[PDB]
């Protein structure tokens, strides 16, 4: 696989292994802990159905090299939108200026090692015919419109990416990945008596578009998701004012795992903890969540959107237990922060592209299942909210305040789910909210393949998950 990627990224651009040696040597003229060369090429396609027609399509290409020079806290970085010897030389000569002092020049010999394959190397853009791709969108349109007469508009989009990466470093790392990513997105508008609402569904992962035609609980996945978007739109159309204030909230399984992404996940990224700016800094071994809570970041999940066969530093993805039975175990790392903390890489060194710096980032972040049934959880609430779906969230990792906003929610009254309620932003303190988790369900699932995470302006594909769970007290941003 490294051989195949090397042929496309190096040989095809007039580069050999010995050029990697030369360029790393240019970096190592300076007094550095580490330097790396990051090569990338990618292809993105999209198709969009709207107004019952194939309205739009795009094809986008990028390629480039990024070069870093690191000394302690410091990074010098330059990059170019081309893969060539001259681009590499120019980028190295700029990056290394981070330190004036000469180094000993003693790099480690480049040597690749095997890692577990997590996803195909088959290019998703070429593996299905154009008309077969467009037929997925046509089927979504037909099914959504047939699902309810109130459906007036359907926008359905297919996106696919095929990405090659290769990384070479002064510590001897030589590693490559072949990364497919597909997503089907559906949005519907419903109208009744002049009132309108919208609903959405979709997902995907690291494989070809055939996934969208495969079986999901006895139906074609694309059909199921078309129907889900309509169902969501109709629930919203019927929704009444949400209540305001502090109350019990039961969160559904899957994407409501945004809770974990915001309440602990960023707060456990090693850059914030190394600097001491996270609320979690210095807290390893302390209770940061209820004893019912084990939270992992897992880059090893076959075929998943959030997984990393290797991270962008060449570290194979790992199953990292962050919190175990409420107790903080450790932090997600990149090479830089791991060194400064006296720790080891974890497989969390991610960058949006060759044109951006890596940092510690999430992969698939989820809570392990517990002993309660979802029914037992709902029945425990006299008055509160049940929220099976969310939009996004946000976190201030210093003050430990986070939010996440519902996309489908209901009252619970006397242990039963009742009236649908309008979207509300929920707010809490991360640690305190995790400590309020009093019941954990036996129904873990991850999201369908929809997560995008933003940090320092860099967007990445991620996963979240959890079982159904109960937070005893959470502030609900309703009006009623």
């Amino acid at each position: 696989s490294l051989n195949l990627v090397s042929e496309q990224l190096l040989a095809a651009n007039g580069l050999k292994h010995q050029d990697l040696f030369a360029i790393l040597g240019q970096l190592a003229e300076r007094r550095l802990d580490y330097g790396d060369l990051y090569f990338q090429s990618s292809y993105h396609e999209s198709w969009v159905l709207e107004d019952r027609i194939i309205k739009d399509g795009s094809y986008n290409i990028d390629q480039g090299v990024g070069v870093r020079a690191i000394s302690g806290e410091k990074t010098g970085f330059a990059y170019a939108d081309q893969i060539s010897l001259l681009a590499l030389e120019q980028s190295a000569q700029a990056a290394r200026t981070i330190v004036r002092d000469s180094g000993d020049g003693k790099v480690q010999t480049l040597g690749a090692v095997e890692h577990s394959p997590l996803y195909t190397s088959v290019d998703p853009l070429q593996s299905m015919s154009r008309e077969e791709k467009l037929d997925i969108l046509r089927r979504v349109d037909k099914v959504a419109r047939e699902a309810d007469k109130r459906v007036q508009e359907v926008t359905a989009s297919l996106s696919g990416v095929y990405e090659l990466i290769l990384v070479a470093a002064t510590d001897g790392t030589l590693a490559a990945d072949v990364r497919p990513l597909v997503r089907l997105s559906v949005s519907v508008l419903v109208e009744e008596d002049g009132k309108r609402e919208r609903g959405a569904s979709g997902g995907g992962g690291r494989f070809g578009y055939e996934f969208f035609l495969a079986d999901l609980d006895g139906e074609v996945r694309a059909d199921a998701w078309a129907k889900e978007a309509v169902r969501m739109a109709l629930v919203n159309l019927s929704a009444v004012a949400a209540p305001a204030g502090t109350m019990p909230v039961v969160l559904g399984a899957g994407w409501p795992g945004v809770l974990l992404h915001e309440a602990v996940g960023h707060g456990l990224e090693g850059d914030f903890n190394r600097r001491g700016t996270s609320v979690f800094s210095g807290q390893v071994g302390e209770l940061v969540a209820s004893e019912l809570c084990t939270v992992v970041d897992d880059g090893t999940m076959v075929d998943r959107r959030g997984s990393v066969a290797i991270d962008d530093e060449g570290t194979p993805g790992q199953y990292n237990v962050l919190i175990e039975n409420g107790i903080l175990k450790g932090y997600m790392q990149d090479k830089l922060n791991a060194r400064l903390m006296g720790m080891t890489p974890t497989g969390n060194g991610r960058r949006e592209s060759y044109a951006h710096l890596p940092m510690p980032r999430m992969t698939n972040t989820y809570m392990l299942p517990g002993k309660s049934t979802p029914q037992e959880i709902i029945e425990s609430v006299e008055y509160g909210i049940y929220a099976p779906n969310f939009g996004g969230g946000q976190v201030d990792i210093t003050s430990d305040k986070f939010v996440f906003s519902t996309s489908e929610a209901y009252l619970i009254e006397n242990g039963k789910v009742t009236k649908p309620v309008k979207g509300a932003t929920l707010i809490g303190s991360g640690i305190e909210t995790m400590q309020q988790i009093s019941m954990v369900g036996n129904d873990l699932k991850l999201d369908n393949g929809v997560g995008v995470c933003g940090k320092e302006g860099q967007s990445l594909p991620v996963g979240v998950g959890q079982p159904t769970l109960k937070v005893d007290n959470l502030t609900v941003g309703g009006t009623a």
Binding site: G392, Q394, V395, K455, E456
Partner: peptide
């Protein structure tokens, strides 16, 4: 920057 903001964190999502």
């Amino acid at each position: 920057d903001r964190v999502y």
